[PDB]
Amino acid sequence: AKIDNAVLPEGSLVLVTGANGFVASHVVEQLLEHGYKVRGTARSASKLANLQKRWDAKYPGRFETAVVEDMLKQGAYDEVIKGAAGVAHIASVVSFSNKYDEVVTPAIGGTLNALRAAAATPSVKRFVLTSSTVSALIPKPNVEGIYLDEKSWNLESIDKAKTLPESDPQKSLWVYAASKTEAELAAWKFMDENKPHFTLNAVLPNYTIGTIFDPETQSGSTSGWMMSLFNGEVSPALALMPPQYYVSAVDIGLLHLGCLVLPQIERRRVYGTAGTFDWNTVLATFRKLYPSKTFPADFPDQGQDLSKFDTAPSLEILKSLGRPGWRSIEESIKDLVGSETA
């Protein structure tokens, strides 16, 4: 169809774990938009109710809600994975407690549980793991000489996550980074050791900006935090996030799609890093979109992100899907907050 030489046949079924998540929901949307059928999991059917309603209207009978209360439970995917040709593991365990083993173990556990299910299911030919740029690094403002490629790993997060005192403002951020790093490392290790009959690719988004399909339940996401600033809320947790790269939710969805169906994309770590930003460039965009609205004044200078990412596979995917280039930050933020128009 739209995609020539697609590895997964038209209308193929794709299992998307944690489909009620912000990023996940865009992955689902892009799949449905491209004619693929989707079975999305959530810890409860109710958690997917609003989105199910949305997708039933836009793509009648293309999305199916599947319940998986414990993504760590042995045999958790035995039923929902049946007949799936592709799998997008986007589900993540809910735990923000600074206990290392308590956070890292489940992260690795959930990832391997999904991979083992896929390995045990012959119909699965493609698997895309939703990782994060934190598996490569935690942003370092004004620091020169940082180039991240597919061989870049956040090895420092492992030590820091367990040595830094609880008083370090970024403690929880390092634990999270360690969890994503170890989890992705475990995924590639599984592929090398077991050599399953499917191809693995990982998408590493930085700060995803886009339309929040279900504000009621997706406001804790990156875009949710940005929306809070739009609404005038300034929180310390916000001033914790340093300058880094944004990526359109639309593009992240396209990146996952590419990893699932493009033949020339195999064993890649696809960076979702469109361009740099800081809270002031965000506020500037808000003011431009809504000139009549009152917004918080600029934050103190937070420096800027001088790091660079090897986005080759990312650009390759976007072009192959007929949507070359990264959607701009203005258009991405417009997707999130809209604009003063009528």
DSSP H or E segment with residue 61: none
Alpha helices in the chain (DSSP H): 22-33, 49-58, 100-120, 155-163, 171-194, 215-218, 222-230, 249-261, 279-289, 312-320, 329-337
Provide the resolution (angstroms): 1.8
Q: Are 176 and 100 in contact (CB under 8 A)?
A: no
Q: Beta partners for 65?
A: 40
What tokens were used for 208?
């995803």
CB atoms inside a 10 Å sphere around CB 188? 14
Q: DSSP secondary structure string, 102-132?
A: HHHHHHHHHHHHHHHHHHH-TT--EEEEE--
How far apart, in whole angstroms, are the C-alpha atoms of residue 27 and residue 201?
14
DSSP letter (8 states) at residue 301? P
Cβ contact 131:202 at 8 Å: yes
Please identify which residue in the block is written with the tokens 């299910």. 117
Q: What's 233-298 look like in SS3?
A: CCCCCCCCCCCEEEEEHHHHHHHHHHHHHCCCCCCCEEEECCEEECHHHHHHHHHHHCCCCCCCCC
In the chain the domains, ranked by start, together with CATH numbers, are: 12-338 (3.40.50.720)
The encoded tokens of residue 101 equal 């083993």
Structure-solving method: X-ray
Name the 3-class secondary structure at 89: strand
* Rounded alpha-carbon distances, angstroms, from residue 90 to 9, 125, 157, 288: 22, 17, 21, 33
Nearest to 36 by CA among 92, 69, 74, 84: 84
C-beta separation of 19 from 80 below 8 A? no
Residue 59 labeled ligand binder: no
Q: State the sign of the Cα–Cα–Cα–Cα dihedral 243, 244, 248, 249.
A: negative
